[PDB]
Curated annotation (Swiss-Prot):
One cellular component term from this protein's GO annotations in UniProt: ATP-binding cassette (ABC) transporter complex, substrate-binding subunit-containing
Entry's family note: Belongs to the bacterial solute-binding protein 1 family.
Keyword vocabulary terms for this entry: Periplasm, Signal, Sugar transport, Transport
GO function terms (MF aspect): carbohydrate transmembrane transporter activity; maltose binding
Transcription regulation among keywords: no
Compartment(s) where it occurs, according to its Swiss-Prot or TrEMBL record: Periplasm
Protein name: Maltose/maltodextrin-binding periplasmic protein
GO terms of biological process kind: maltodextrin transmembrane transport; maltose transport
Species, as recorded: Escherichia coli O157:H7
Length: 513
């Protein structure tokens, strides 16, 4: 099994206090003889699910809590079971952030929210509104400075503004209700785009560029989290940390993250990982070592948070946090961020209009759920002979028309392939939920081998329906939902970009109209 026993490998993002974490690791080694390696791989949040699915990767992964539901759904995390006395050492709301399907899937570390960071020597009174920024930038440009620079390549940083006037990810979670392309989101992202068009900001600005400009005194404000304050301390900029500006009179609403540590389900060192996280890291001295390297924010550990809470920068962080919302941890968060990242980048660069960009983001964010709705309904009605009577939601005319198209087209595909499907089904031993796991390997492989088009997607789904009929016949109707989920995963994981390019299921209805 790929992960080595008797050592701990930890992954944490490169903007965090990884040298402090490695000090905690040295302490552990001194008491236990177990060496701890801390690494900060690029794109770790994307790499983890790839490697862990093979039984490889780090023993411990640190990331905000939003990615952890996806990893837990995929079976990539160990359930953690801290006892009552340990649970009571942390804030309950930090535990809530790492609860998925009623199980704790990670240890919470610290609460992170973005704030407005400003240079007090350039801007003694920071703007209370977004709307006053253009005028401020004009005033600053006369003196060779700019008003505001922040990372436009990661949507986390633009989210507070998108959300201010009513953008939202998933309504509180109703995965059916997505608010990425509503009027509020459009208003916020249009304001950003106008800043860029009026040369108050540059579309190419990334994390490093914005940090460098702020810490060199070139720009009067940035938007960043507590991890950033160490580099600003070293630069000797006189800075303040404050509430984000309002937009259309309403607060900026940052997405609040709880930095959390999960244990790899494939680790043979789970007991050492638990001992390290509970008895070395989540202690006053452990968190202090980390926080001294790069500030964590509002830590989850009550004893130590009471000391940090007196710092005005933490107060500001918590003020922004209360105006914001805790991120969801559901599995489609990954897709939501991918869609939104592209929409912001393309709207900023002018490759797409705001309307265009947010439409595509809404399609991408809704794709898994919409696909599972169609596929699960078609498989279940095929298997049983009766349609599901529940409505689709308020966003569900697309689901409905896609199901109707699928019935029409799929009737013929199953009819014409009945002999071939009967043959393929016989080769396979599909008798219970264990077997369906295997099918995913087969179905991915077979599906990916050929060309990408709607006809072949209909054939994949049609075979799924043929299997569902068989499942029902042998009293394994409970396997139909897992089959539908597995087909949906295959389809959206391998064809997401192609699907969004087609306008999702509306494209399907169009192709076969
Ligand atoms: C694992 C079962 C799947 S998934 C799938 N996805 C798209 N298309 C498929 N079949 C067509 C003919 C295609 O490739 O266009 C299949 C088959 C499938 C099913 C039965 C068969 N008999 C011979 C070959 C074959 C293939
Ligand atoms: O930009 C989308 C991105 O947002 C959040 O990632 C944050 C992270 O939480 C912070 O700890 C800090 O590292 O900056 C990151 C943004 O660059 C989400 O947690 C992440 O899943 C998402 O992709
Ligand atoms: Na990164």
């Amino acid at each position: 099994m790929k992960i080595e026993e008797g050592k701990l490998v930890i992954w944490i993002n490169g903007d965090k206090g990884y040298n402090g974490l490695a000090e905690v690791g040295k302490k552990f080694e001194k008491d236990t003889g177990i060496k701890v390696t801390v690494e900060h791989p690029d794109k770790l949040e994307e790499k983890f699910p790839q490697v862990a699915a093979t039984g490889d990767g780090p023993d411990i992964i640190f990331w905000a809590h939003d990615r952890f539901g996806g990893y837990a759904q995929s079976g990539l995390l160990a359930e953690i079971t801290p006892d009552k006395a340990f649970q009571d050492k942390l804030y309950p709301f930090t535990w809530d952030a790492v609860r998925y399907n009623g199980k704790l899937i990670a240890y919470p570390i610290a609460v992170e929210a973005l704030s407005l960071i400003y240079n007090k020597d350039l801007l003694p009174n920071p703007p209370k509104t977004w709307e006053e920024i253009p005028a401020l930038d004009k005033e600053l440009k006369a003196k060779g400075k700019s008003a505001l620079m922040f990372n436009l390549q990661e949507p986390y940083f633009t989210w507070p503004l998108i959300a201010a006037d009513g953008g939202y990810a998933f309504k509180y979670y109703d995965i059916k209700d997505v608010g990425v392309d509503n009027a509020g989101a459009k208003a916020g992202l249009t304001f950003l785009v106008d800043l860029i068009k009026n040369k108050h900001m540059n579309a190419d600005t990334d994390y490093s560029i914005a940090e460098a400009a702020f810490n060199k005194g070139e720009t009067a404000m940035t938007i960043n989290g507590p991890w950033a304050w160490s580099n600003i301390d070293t630069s000797a900029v006189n800075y303040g940390v404050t509430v984000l500006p309002t937009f259309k009179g309403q607060p900026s609403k940052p997405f609040v993250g709880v930095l959390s540590a999960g244990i790899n389900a494939a680790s043979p060192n789970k007991e050492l990982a638990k001992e390290f996280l509970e008895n070395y890291l989540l202690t006053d001295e452990g968190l202090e070592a980390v926080n001294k390297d790069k500030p964590l924010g509002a830590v989850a550990l009550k004893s130590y948070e009471e000391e940090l809470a007196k710092d005005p920068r933490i107060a500001a962080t918590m003020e922004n946090a209360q105006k914001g919302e805790i991120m969801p941890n559901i599995p489609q968060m990954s897709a939501f961020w991918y869609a939104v990242r592209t929409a912001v980048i393309n709207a900023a660069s002018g490759r797409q209009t705001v309307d265009e960009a947010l439409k595509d983001a809404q399609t991408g964010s809704e794709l898994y759920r919409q696909s599972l709705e169609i596929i699960s309904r078609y498989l279940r009605e095929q298997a049983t002979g009766a349609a599901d009577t529940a409505p689709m939601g308020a966003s569900g005319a697309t689901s409905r028309k896609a199901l109707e198209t699928l019935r029409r087209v799929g009737d013929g595909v199953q009819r014409n392939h009945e002999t071939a499907f009967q043959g393929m089904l016989r080769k396979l031993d599909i008798k219970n939920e264990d077997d369906v796991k295997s099918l995913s390997r087969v179905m991915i492989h077979v599906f990916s081998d050929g060309v990408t088009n709607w006809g072949r997607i209909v054939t994949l789904i049609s075979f799924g329906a043929f299997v569902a009929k068989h499942l029902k016949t042998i009293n394994q109707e409970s396997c139909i939902e897992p089959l539908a989920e597995s087909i949906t995963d295959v389809l959206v994981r391998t064809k997401r970009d192609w699907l969004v390019k087609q306008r999702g299921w509306d494209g399907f209805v169009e192709f076969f109209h």
